[PDB]
């Protein structure tokens, strides 16, 4: 009874507790084949890949996990600067996660915070990967760098989100389903959560009405305004690229950013607002079964 | 009886409530001598003024009023453009208030969201003011301009509170209180309430509690990410200045030289500036009175 009972948007997929020296991934599992990774973001869980999983697993063996200290995750105590929850510490704990499933080498597709940590995998760890996939974002650096009064607007949640504690946490605590809700449909090409299977929203919203995991949640921005900044810089600074296989996709409703910090990327727009993978599942699912399939 | 306890903090003046076009204007009014309006801003309301208005009061015919919607000013009904909360809009609202106590023309010194009021009404009505003061800003446009990660970090609330409603409205409403001595201390040198009186906390305290009133605060925000922001672009692009005779005070550790350093961004927006830093954070009158009060006196002051 540790645990709620919630759908099972999965059918045929395992589930795997894995162990790390900082907590456990949860994860379900499908498919046979080469690995694939999948990793959500902000604020979703491992179920945002509801709708792609069981097309990609026709092909891949696909390990679709929950962020560490998101969904169903163990929360590593975090510290002043947000360690655990910095892009480059999930993307090592993400790796002795792979591990543990017997694979030192993978690909990996990630959505918004899960793709920044995987981004950061593929600059920090080029090797561990074979393929790349980034869903609806730029790097960290970049939105950073472009913020004006236009972005402040935009992606209000990074800023706030990365005051210092207990603001924002005291603040999402008055009402989290409705923020949960009001964040997932303002990004949607709809404007509204008719994009998401009711049963996924259920998850979201159970994750989200947990006080600790929203503190995760905001260690998350927190280094996304700091560490996970400062880590970028250095990259730019000394012009280090990717060098792994990369596919960007982004909803119409990027590419030149990317090849400034990528050496071998393709790229796509999706009719989607920012949720590719439940908002044009099948146009996300094939872009991803070509590239990944090509090795 | 549903008035809440709440101190009389300016000693002999009297109470007013003003009617306009778009709603009555609370004020205390005290003093003896030409008339100076003083408005205050976010999260604060009149009572803020209470450690400099009877200095002023020795000199001026101090008028101490809570802007639209704030305070115990009647909130006017807002729209889409979030119009009466501009402070184009608030300004008329303010003159028609100051006509009312029959001041065609005027002194006015007004800090943070008051202050926008305040330069806005110079660019709009010069002719109403003899001189003008503002407390720890710039203009809307130049904090806009300036919104690079380390300000929108600094200043997150100018984003968070311009989101559509009913989002932050929803979040404040999760623990007003917490949000307002959080927004009051860490915007203090000390970061903490030591420089306020506890009963002007109270006054901002039991406003901020108001769902009504911090709706209305959202409204200001709006306008200002909005309508404030395309204002003072016109006047940018155009090149107009503020003729009134002005000064610009700021916290040595405020909010307005967190951008830039606040003399020379106010020279591009008036021909005829004074300024000064305090030593204070952003609440100038309440963490620096005595120094506040006498740059005032000594601004809005024939004598010497
Ligand atoms: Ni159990
Ligand atoms: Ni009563």
Same mark, same amino acid.
């Not at 090797?127 to 980034?134: F, I, M, T, Y």
């Given at each position: $009874?540790?645990?709620?009972?919630?759908?099972?948007?999965?059918? &045929?997929? %395992?589930?795997?507790? =894995?162990?790390?020296?900082?907590?456990? =991934?949860?994860? #379900?599992? %499908? &498919?046979? &084949? !080469?690995?694939?990774?999948?990793?959500?973001?902000?604020?979703?869980?491992?179920?945002?890949?509801?709708?792609?999983?069981? *097309?990609?697993?026709?092909?891949? /063996?696909?390990?679709?996990?929950?962020?560490? $200290? +998101?969904?169903?995750? @163990?929360?590593?105590?975090?510290?002043?600067?947000?360690?655990? +929850?910095?892009?480059?510490?999930?993307? *090592?704990?993400?790796?002795?996660?792979?591990?543990?499933?017997?694979?030192?080498?993978?690909?990996?597709? $990630?959505?918004?915070?899960?793709?920044?940590?995987?981004?950061?995998?593929?600059? @920090?760890?080029?090797?561990?990967?074979?393929?790349?996939?980034?869903?609806?974002?730029? !790097?960290?650096?970049?939105?950073?760098?472009?913020?004006? #009064?236009?972005?402040?607007? *935009?992606?209000?949640?990074?800023?706030?989100?990365?005051?210092?504690?207990?603001?924002?946490?005291?603040?999402? &605590?008055?009402?989290?389903?409705?923020?949960?809700?009001? /964040?997932?449909?303002?990004?949607?090409?709809?404007?509204?959560?008719?994009?998401?299977?009711?049963?996924?929203?259920?998850?979201?919203? =159970?994750?989200?009405?947990?006080?600790?995991?929203?503190?995760?949640?905001?260690? @998350? +921005?927190?280094?996304?305004?700091?560490?996970?900044?400062?880590?970028?810089?250095?990259?730019?600074?000394? $012009?280090?690229? =990717?060098?792994?296989?990369?596919?960007?996709?982004?909803?119409?409703?990027?590419?030149?950013?990317?090849? *400034?910090?990528?050496?071998?990327?393709? %790229?796509? !727009?999706?009719?989607? %607002?920012?949720?590719?993978?439940?908002?044009?599942? @099948?146009?996300?699912?094939?872009?991803?079964?070509?590239?990944?399939?090509?090795?």
């Amino acid at each position: $009874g540790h645990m709620p009972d919630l759908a099972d948007l999965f059918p &045929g997929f %395992g589930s795997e507790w =894995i162990n790390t020296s900082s907590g456990r =991934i949860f994860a #379900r599992v %499908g &498919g046979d &084949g !080469p690995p694939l990774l999948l990793l959500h973001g902000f604020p979703q869980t491992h179920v945002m890949w509801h709708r792609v999983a069981p *097309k990609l697993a026709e092909r891949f /063996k696909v390990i679709v996990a929950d962020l560490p $200290g +998101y969904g169903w995750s @163990d929360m590593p105590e975090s510290d002043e600067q947000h360690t655990p +929850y910095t892009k480059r510490a999930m993307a *090592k704990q993400l790796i002795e996660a792979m591990e543990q499933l017997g694979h030192v080498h993978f690909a990996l597709a $990630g959505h918004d915070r899960g793709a920044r940590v995987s981004y950061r995998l593929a600059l @920090d760890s080029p090797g561990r990967l074979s393929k790349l996939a980034v869903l609806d974002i730029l !790097p960290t650096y970049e939105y950073w760098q472009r913020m004006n #009064r236009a972005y402040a607007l *935009k992606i209000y949640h990074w800023s706030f989100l990365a005051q210092p504690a207990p603001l924002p946490e005291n603040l999402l &605590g008055g009402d989290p389903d409705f923020y949960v809700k009001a /964040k997932l449909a303002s990004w949607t090409r709809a404007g509204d959560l008719s994009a998401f299977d009711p049963r996924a929203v259920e998850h979201y919203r =159970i994750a989200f009405a947990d006080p600790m995991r929203r503190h995760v949640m905001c260690e @998350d +921005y927190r280094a996304g305004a700091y560490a996970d900044f400062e880590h970028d810089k250095i990259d730019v600074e000394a $012009g280090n690229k =990717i060098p792994v296989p990369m596919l960007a996709l982004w909803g119409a409703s990027p590419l030149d950013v990317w090849r *400034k910090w990528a050496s071998d990327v393709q %790229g796509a !727009p999706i009719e989607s %607002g920012h949720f590719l993978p439940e908002e044009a599942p @099948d146009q996300t699912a094939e872009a991803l079964v070509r590239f990944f399939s090509a090795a």
